[PDB]
């Protein structure tokens, strides 16, 4: 095995251990895609964004070792994204969040920057950790209802072992 293969095998191994350890947290929820989240706060909003709604958020992104690769909080002002403009783990999570929700997201590499990595700071095969707060959705949000979301999340917890 070449060095690159051995290095990426290592990256995949420790990344998978990280994902497993975070999914085993009692308040963590694992979704079928592989996305894991913990609720930091439950918002009072009643609608999740649609795939093309503009979401105002505060976030901090960290690698498995805690290194911060990007943070709107450090910039002192929120950032606005649509779900269809962001990595797959965020696209999925945002459509399951309502205004005021604050989540810790644990994103496996295949729902993040994948085999190439990104930004110079995220190497190949990196899981990512985000603390994300959904502050507002432009014009209220045209996605799932709070009740639709909660059923998905309830049912997701039920079928964890499946
Ligand atoms: C301007 C922004 C809309 C772009 C967007 N950003 C993100 O989706 C993530 C999550 C949301 C917060 C922002 N970040 S981030 O903080 O992780 C970026 C980052 C990475 C590495 C680093 F070193 C520093 C920062 C992006 O990349 N989309 C392209 C794409 C889509 C699907 C698959 N792959 C790539
Ligand atoms: Na971390
Ligand atoms: Na939610
Ligand atoms: Na990644
Ligand atoms: Na990566």
Residue numbers in the entry: 5 to 166
Copy the relevant paper text:
Macrophage infectivity potentiator (MIP) proteins are key microbial virulence factors that facilitate host cell infection, intracellular pathogen replication, and dissemination. They are found in a variety of pathogens of both bacterial and eukaryotic origin, including Burkholderia pseudomallei, the causative agent of melioidosis, Legionella pneumophila, leading to Legionnaires’ disease, and the protozoan parasites Trypanosoma cruzi and Leishmania subspecies. All MIP and FKBP proteins share a general domain topology in their core PPIase domain with an amphipathic five-stranded β-sheet wrapping around a short α-helix, thereby forming a hydrophobic active site32.
In all cases, we found that the inhibitor molecules bound within the expected FKBP-like domain cleft that forms the MIP active site. For LpMIP100–213, the affinity for the tracer was significantly lower than that for all other constructs, thus requiring a 5-fold increase in the protein concentration. NJS224 carries a fluorinated thioaryl group (henceforth denoted X1) and an isopropyl group (X2A) and gives rise to a single resonance at −113.19 ppm. A highly similar interaction mode for both inhibitors is also apparent from their nearly identical CSP pattern when bound to 15N-labeled TcMIP. The fluorobenzyl group attached to the sulfoxyl group, i.e., the group present in either inhibitor, is nestled into a hydrophobic pocket formed by F43 in β-strand 3a and V97/I98 in the loop between β4 and β5 in BpMIP and the corresponding residues F73 and M125/I126 in TcMIP. In the crystal structures, the inhibitor’s piperidine ring rests within a hydrophobic cage formed by conserved aromatic residues (Y33/Y63, F53/F85, and W66/W94 in BpMIP and TcMIP, respectively).
